[PDB]
């Protein structure tokens with residue numbers, strides 16, 4: 001029993017973190033085989049943050065302008081290139097702790113674990129979601145860029161996020177590991193800001209199933225709803241539309257609990273309209289939306305990873 | 307910016323997890339140097355769970371009744387002993403990934419990271435607190451026993467919890483790594499149950515300071531309180547008494563924010579009496595009590611670990 005915001009074990013990623021220095025800027029890099037991946041803004045200087053021309057900045061650099069440190073060991077940079085907003089530094093040494101890995105670009109609403117790092121050293125691990133507005137509600141300070149987000153599947157680390165920027169509302173923006181930003185964001189100091197966010201309906205429903213699995217039914221009711229009438233209510237509460245694909249994805253949790261998806265939707269409708277009237281669900285007074293259906297099955301079934 | 311329930315990176319602990327089998331029972335063990343630590347109830351059988359005599363059960367066992375598996379490798383048990391409620395299995399191989407480590411028995415209100423494991427394989431990591439009633443609100447299923455809780459300090463893993471039992475309310479009980487239970491609990495199937503819990507006042511105050519550090523002041527007020535008058539209110543809301551030592555411990559957060567501890571206490575008093583009236587603090591509609599003062603300083607200052 002129990003239900004916690006649960007991250008993946010971080011060891012396979014810890015073994016990949018290094019420190020990258022260019023000029024006076026230091027941040028984190030990801031060392032896989034003989035390549036170190038890091039944010040290209042490591043090559044920026046203070047007076048040219050408004051609209052850097054990264055191609056022009058990078059052509060002026062030499063391999064020896066890049067200092068890569070793994071633990072106490074210096075790695076010599078022997079080549080470099082830029083791919084979108086990431087710099088790829090070829091190093092003289094292959095990382096002997098390279099896990100089996102993939103790079104994946106995730107969809108909004110998907111969750112992942114973040115290994116927050118400073119000066120190439122891991123600080124902590126926490127779970128986040130890609131919000132519908134393609135920001136993440138992270139916990140990041142100066143020097144955290146190059147920290148990555150990931151999922152693990154059997155033995156394989158799927159890297160999906162590298163940290164680059166903090167937006168004026170205190171939320172975070174970054175790239176996939178091929179250097180493409182999530183959302184309409186840029187690695188430059190400009191007026192950019194999170195678009196209006198929405199609540200991830202299919203995840204709220206998954207978490208309500210998690211609550212039932214863990215023994216709590218107080219919020220259920222005898223009603224059902226059509227998908228159309230549910231979505232009419234969802235829209236009113238700034239919830240994302242629920243699609244038939246979402247309904248299909250919730251199939252297993254519905255089958256395990258014996259509660260039809262549209263019946264759980266009627267329960268969610270009542271919670272939106274009535275509130276919780278002083279009660280909690282899985283220790284929260286809010287409707288939680290950063291557990292995917294797969295997250296619930298994982299934690300309520302004890303899946304492991306090697 | 308940002309504030310998340312943040313666990314320690316788990317890699318140093320992942321390298322220590324093994325699988326222990328006795329008879330038909332399998333659970334997890336902790337492999338440090340040439341010793342594997344695990345719950346002694348691995349030697350129990352189904353029909354003798356009500357009141358096992360562990361000394362009598364263990365004297366009937368041989369080293370070869372214990373199967374220890376690290377990855378795919380079998381470790382041969384060459385000695386065994388019982389210390390309180392933990393079994394110590396001497397193995398023919400020292401763990402080459404043994405981190406620098408200590409065993410610590412923590413006080414109620416302290417937090418730690420849990421590496422939930424099944425069949426010796428890590429599943430996930432999450433943060434918990436030792437509750438005042440010496441239960442933990444974990445997330446644990448069949449086969450999770452032997453999973454450990456820990457803190458990291460520089461390079462040193464301080465193990466403080468090994469998982470043994472689930473209580474009827476769905477909360478969890480276990481031991482320090484010397485096998486002494488936290489709380490009045492036992493490794494036997496008997497009527498035991500969590501005592502009434504309380505809210506960890508000094509942690510709530512720490513989290514309110516975290517909210518101020520992160521830019522949110524809405525809940526502050528112009529009032530102050532005496533410690534005595536605050537505690538009169540705390541008691542009414544099932545909060546633990548705040549001591550002068552707690553006040554001293556909050557000194558740094560008070561100094562960083564410019565808000566005297568007793569002024570923050572007046573803010574907490576108003577929140578207890580008034581509620582939040584639809585507002586949130588750090589993304590919660592409840593007053594969070596599983597961040598210690600040190601947790602706040604760690605995450606708001608970016609301390610790292612090697």
Ligand SMILES: *C(=N)[C@H](C[C@@H]1CCNC1=O)NC(=O)[C@@H]1Cc2ccccc2CN1C(=O)[C@@H](NC(=O)C(F)(F)F)C(C)(C)C
Nearest residue numbers: 041049140141142143144145164165166167187188189190
């Ligand atoms: C990476 N080390 C750091 C992570 C930040 C620092 C505070 N919290 C975080 O998450 N990233 C930056 O400081 C980036 C880097 C950068 C590249 C090009 C141009 C300007 C910058 C400055 N950075 C910002 O994140 C700034 N934000 C913005 O400019 C914007 F809001 F995204 F537009 C700022 C937080 C104001 C420093």
Ligand SMILES: *C(=N)[C@H](C[C@@H]1CCNC1=O)NC(=O)[C@@H]1Cc2ccccc2CN1C(=O)[C@@H](NC(=O)C(F)(F)F)C(C)(C)C
Nearest residue numbers: 347355446447448449450451470471472473493494495496
């Ligand atoms: C360890 N693998 C497992 C962890 C449990 C299983 C479900 N959630 C958990 O956290 N621990 C047990 O199953 C223990 C072991 C044990 C030792 C001696 C005697 C009886 C048991 C059975 N266990 C229990 O946790 C049971 N709880 C209690 O007996 C009590 F409530 F604590 F009294 C029970 C969950 C009913 C199996």
